[model samples]
Target chain A: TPVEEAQQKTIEAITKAINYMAKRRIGALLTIERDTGMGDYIETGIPLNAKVSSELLINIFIPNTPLHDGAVIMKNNEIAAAACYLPLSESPFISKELGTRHRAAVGISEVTDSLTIIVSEETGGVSVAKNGDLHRELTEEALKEMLEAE
Target chain B: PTPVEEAQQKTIEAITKAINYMAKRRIGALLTIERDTGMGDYIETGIPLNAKVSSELLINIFIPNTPLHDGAVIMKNNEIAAAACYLPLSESPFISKELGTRHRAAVGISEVTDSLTIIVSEETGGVSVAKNGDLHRELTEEALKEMLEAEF
Candidate 1:
């Protein structure tokens, strides 16, 4: 039941993080499990073993910090890695104007079974990626639904 | 490189990731790779996921104490078709007593269906594969990958 407890806290933390960053228009991306040495995917980040918390996540995503440039990876309700780079979307129909963060969100979803959260620095709009579909302009409840998906 | 091969390749990659993750953490996991035989009946027995197969999602499902971790995951068309699925248990008395319900179900599903099943033992942190009514236990990572790579 530790995992269940961890998961509940993770969902709450994610909700808080998104709300905080989205209000301030701070761009961020988060990829939740699952990695390795097979080179099937790339991981480059500051390794971390801290428990998940909205305040901690908010601090990590602070603009221009050393750890703010890339995605943060969460597993077992902990921040496993930060500043991790993700693959870019190669789908032909993706909007050309979409920034690197949004593209990366969509890109990782296309290849993995991850639910990605994206917050736009430009518009402060919240978005989510799952199964290669980008759901843009998410409301408060919408984001919770995605995170609560079991 | 047909679509079929591509899908299988992705399945292999995902399974490999999940197996290693669970093995190290001593997380008990059971996953069934559906092949020629359709597991529609078994799929209906559990929670319908209908999500693309990825190592992250697979790892999440087996997080100890999670609702879905108790049952097996069924893969169809390289996607996680369902989770927490109840498979037929092998009632054979000749089976090893050391094996638990997870291992028994792995072998049980393979008996009636042409599917491949993988198990990570919670008791011993061992890796196992069940195919064609034979159970391969305590497999090395290399051996497991090779078996997974084989075309079903």
Candidate 2:
């Protein structure tokens, strides 16, 4: 089916984007809407109409861009929103050393089935949050596998 | 790392940008990456770019309506050797009618040289790769990346 192909393309693009950001030490928080409604979880980000791609993601997360500060919400095959806000994690298990981006990634996954990808600016590492678990420091191949498994 | 690996990395980066940009907008593009075989004969047929390969440079070169947008862009020495170059069309009867001139030319070039050709269809935005007289059609970005990395 074309939808299946589209889903794979989206996963590949997101995986590539995460790797690109990690290499550049660019921080990013992205939420992939899986099975839950994100209406109540988001703070209404600036609407965007663009296909998910590494080039687009890299440009959007550039160091001083206006939309670089917040999360990008991806729905289905398109990037639905940017600079969107996600709830912070209330779980005590989360380390205090983790910043707002990590917390937000976990928080959204806890309430929804959405998979969140985070690229740390300081460490240049890629992390994924799914089913309330945050898996950190994934390689490009590992990242692709995780997205495919999702 | 070996020099070959470094060159492949740069080629992958530049080609990735061009492929992604063209795929999203359904912009038709033909790109040939020269391998062990030289492309001097084909290089002379197009406009000489002779520029260092960059993401933006590949993207702009393939943009629709641009003077260099009509033909194939050949990459040699990890740099764009020429653009708007003509390529022979495969005369094989086994070729699918569904494939347009861009794709036919992709297979055409691949049949004669060890170079790999990438095609982005304007109709469907599907990414296809032609190598060693075989065409791998409708590849996702991951497959394309893996193919290039492994081939180079």
Candidate 3:
């Protein structure tokens, strides 16, 4: 029943992410993809050609990230879903502050079973792929705090 | 076949998005009707017959609480539906085959979701809301107007 429970929890995480993004005064979009294969594959990935808007604050969260407990397999009996967020513009950049996309992604992951993988379009730096473990970045900590409040 | 399921899921996603949008805007509570006919039984049994049909229907109802009522427009697929904006005493007298009041539908939806409803009356043109069926009675059109105008 762990799989069923995990799947339900994943649905909750996705719903939370969608609601959070939709309420923004600024524009944002959340995409969900269901995986149907077995074996360990990246639960969520930022495409190299992802379109960015000046007002976008992209964030991607994968519930139960690292998925190391077991490979996220979608055989006849398995179902896997991933949630991703894309802000209309780049979130305000702080020198060391996680970019908007990274912060947003981590924010969603910290609150839910999902894991966040943030890719900085500016430097193309993969800032955070936070799972059960917290990251060294202050931005990540701040985002985590904010998400907890939700 | 999976693609069809995905499309249906997308529709659910869109409806949910609209509901969240209305909630965030703090306009009014929304209720959704899935296109699946199987959901019809649930809707009929779960909600009042006068309740607005879809998630988008709830959004449109909240958008123009006043004009639609005075115009006596019954919301169909596209016409601006109106609400009576009054609370139910016994059976809603506002329920006419003509234009239905938003208040009654709001009450119907609220009964299903425990959500708050806003509307303007058909008879007196008074704005009222069905708050848990108690009927607060003091919500003036000006107050409703102000509430509607306030930023979400």
Q: lDDT scores for all predictions?
A: 0.80, 0.80, 0.33
| C-alpha lDDT of residue A92 in model 2 | 85
Better of 2 and 3 by lDDT: 2
CA displacement after TM-score superposition, residue A121 of candidate 3 (Å): 12
Fraction of true inter-chain Cα contacts (below 8 Å) kept per model?
0.00, 0.00, 0.00
Where model 3 places Cα greater than 4 Å from the true spot, the runs are A8-98, A101-114, A117-128, A131-150, B1-26, B30-91, B95-101, B107-127, B131-152
Q: Against the true structure, what is model 3's DockQ?
A: 0.01
lDDT of 2 at B142: 88
Question: How does each model score on TM-score?
Answer: 0.53, 0.50, 0.26
Q: What tens-digit string does per-residue lDDT give for candidate 3 at A1-150?
A: 996765554444433433343343212223222232212332442111211111111122222211111111122221232222322222243244544554554444343444343333334333332332324332434544433432
Kindly report which residue pairs in candidate 1 clash with one another. Answer: A33-B56, A34-B56
TM-score of chain B of each: 0.94, 0.94, 0.31
Best by DockQ: 1
Docking class of predicted structure 1? incorrect
Query: Stretches of candidate 2 above 4 Å error?
Result: A1-150, B2-4
Kindly give the stretch of ten consecutive residues in candidate 2 chain A with the minimal lDDT sum.
Answer: A41-50
Ranking by lDDT: 2, 1, 3
